Amino acid sequence: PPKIQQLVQDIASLTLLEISDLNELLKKTLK
Amino acid sequence: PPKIQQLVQDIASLTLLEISDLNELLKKTLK
Amino acid sequence: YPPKIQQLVQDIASLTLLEISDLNELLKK
Amino acid sequence: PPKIQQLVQDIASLTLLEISDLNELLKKTLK
Amino acid sequence: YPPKIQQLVQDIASLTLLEISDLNELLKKTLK
Amino acid sequence: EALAGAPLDNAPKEYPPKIQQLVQDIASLTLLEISDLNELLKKTLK
Amino acid sequence: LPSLPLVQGELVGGLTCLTAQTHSLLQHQPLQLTTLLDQYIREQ
Amino acid sequence: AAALARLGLRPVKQVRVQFCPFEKNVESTRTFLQTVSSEKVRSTNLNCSVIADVRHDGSEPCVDVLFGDGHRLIMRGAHLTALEMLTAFASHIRARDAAGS
């Protein structure tokens, strides 16, 4: 689907420092 | 980032009956 | 994985359904 | 296919020191 | 099916003990 | 024509020449070729 | 040493391990998504 | 065996007979093992024991004896005849036996 395609392309292009923000929210904000 | 914020808003808006289709793809199509 | 081979895996991800089925056979086992 | 066939030529050509790090390297980055 | 792939079947399929395990052990170190 | 000497317990493990030669050949072969070979071997076991 | 049949079984397992290597790298995405879907139900 | 059997391993506690059978110079030590391992020699003192270990590291054969009051005695078989080891060993334990009683 169109929604899933957009998300995949984003994660690969994201930078190290910026990916850490994603990892932080899931492990901490949602826990 | 701008991309991550969009994903969170979409999931909460979807209805219970419709979210079932999104979950099916990940569990069956990609597996 | 060096970039040269990371690219190849990326190419395998964006494959046709028939070729994906061939890849799936390896993944299934 | 024109993609998986080349996937092989890389692995066999990798040096022993390379291969060892790769499994740790990509797993530590894409996880 | 090809001839070269047939040869490898003969060597590995039937051997004595303390032989098959040594061949695989070296392969594991090379892979790792 | 003569059996090889037993290695010392302290000495590192010594492997037959044939076994060492086979290891080198497997690396050269492609995974696709190895995959075809692997299939025939499994049938022989069962 | 284990019986000869047992060593032969390990060889069969090794073949699966070779394929699992590449699959394991890809297997990271599905695993992350699956765990998240369960957590949401728990929070509710 | 007969000679020592008359003496008996009374004051001894344990023995050690490490040798590498592959090595050529272990003939004397193995002959020494036979005598000490003899049932007649050993039976005398069921409590007393013996170590005849085996290795393949290339070490020269050695015989080490454990006693009580008497100090440990170590003999290298490589350059010792079986008779000389036995007679010298028997002399040592005899002196130790006198010291004990």
Nearest to G15 by CA among C29, F30, F24, D15: C29
Tokens 């890389």: give the residue: D10
Distance from CA of C12 to the nearest CA of D (A): 6
Cβ-contact F21, H71 below 8 angstroms: no
**Tokens at H12, concatenated:** 């001894």
- How many Cβ atoms sit within 10 Å of the Cβ of residue H86? 21
**Tokens at A22, concatenated:** 């994603």
Angle subtended by helix axes C3-13 and G4-26, to nearest 10: 80
How many residues are given for chain F? 46
Torsion region of F15: left, alpha or beta (phi above 0 gives left; psi -120 to 50 gives alpha): beta
Q: Which residues have C-beta within 8 Å of that of residue G15, sequence separation ≥ 6? A: F38, F42
Q: Longest Cα pair distance anywhere in chain F, in angstroms?
A: 40
Residues 1-44 of G with CB under 8 A from E: 1, 4, 7-8, 10-11, 14, 18
Tokens 């492609």: give the residue: F30
Strands (DSSP E) along chain D, which ranges?
Answer: none
Residues of E in contact with F37 (CB under 8 A): 5, 8-9
Helix (H, G, I), strand (E, B) or coil at F14: coil
Distance CA E30, CA D19 (A): 9
Cβ-contact F2, E9 below 8 angstroms: no
Distance from CA of E30 to the nearest CA of F (A): 9
Cβ-contact H51, H101 below 8 angstroms: no
Distance CA F7, CA F25 (A): 26
Distance CA B12, CA G40 (A): 11
Cβ-contact H61, H78 below 8 angstroms: yes
Distance CA C6, CA D19 (A): 13
Cβ-contact H35, H80 below 8 angstroms: no
Q: H72 φ, ψ to 5°? A: -60, 140
Q: Which residues have C-beta within 8 Å of that of residue G39, sequence separation ≥ 6? A: A30, A31
Strand partners, H54: H19
Element (H, E) at E27: helix E20-31
Spatial strand order of the sheet with H73-76 comes to H12-18, H62-67, H73-76
What count of Cα atoms within 13 Å lies in the side-chain half-sphere of residue E5? 15
Residues of F in contact with D9 (CB under 8 A): 30
Distance CA H86, CA G21 (A): 65
- How many Cβ atoms sit within 10 Å of the Cβ of residue B7? 13
The single-letter code of the amino acid at G7 is V
The single-letter code of the amino acid at F14 is E
- How many Cβ atoms sit within 10 Å of the Cβ of residue A25? 12
Q: G38 φ, ψ to 5°? A: -70, -40
Residues of E in contact with D20 (CB under 8 A): 32
Distance CA H70, CA H95 (A): 9
Nearest to H70 by CA among H95, H47, H90: H95
Cβ-contact C2, D13 below 8 angstroms: no
Cβ-contact H9, H40 below 8 angstroms: no
Tokens 């964006």: give the residue: C14
Per residue, the 3-state secondary structure of H24-48, as one string, reads HHHHHHHHHHHHHHCHHHHHCCCCC
- How many Cβ atoms sit within 10 Å of the Cβ of residue H67? 20
Distance CA H4, CA G41 (A): 86
Tokens 């899931």: give the residue: A26
Distance CA H45, CA H15 (A): 13
Question: What is the Cα gyration radius of chain A?
Answer: 11
Q: Which residues have C-beta within 8 Å of that of residue D31, sequence separation ≥ 6? A: G28
- Residue in chain E lying closest to F34 (CA): E5
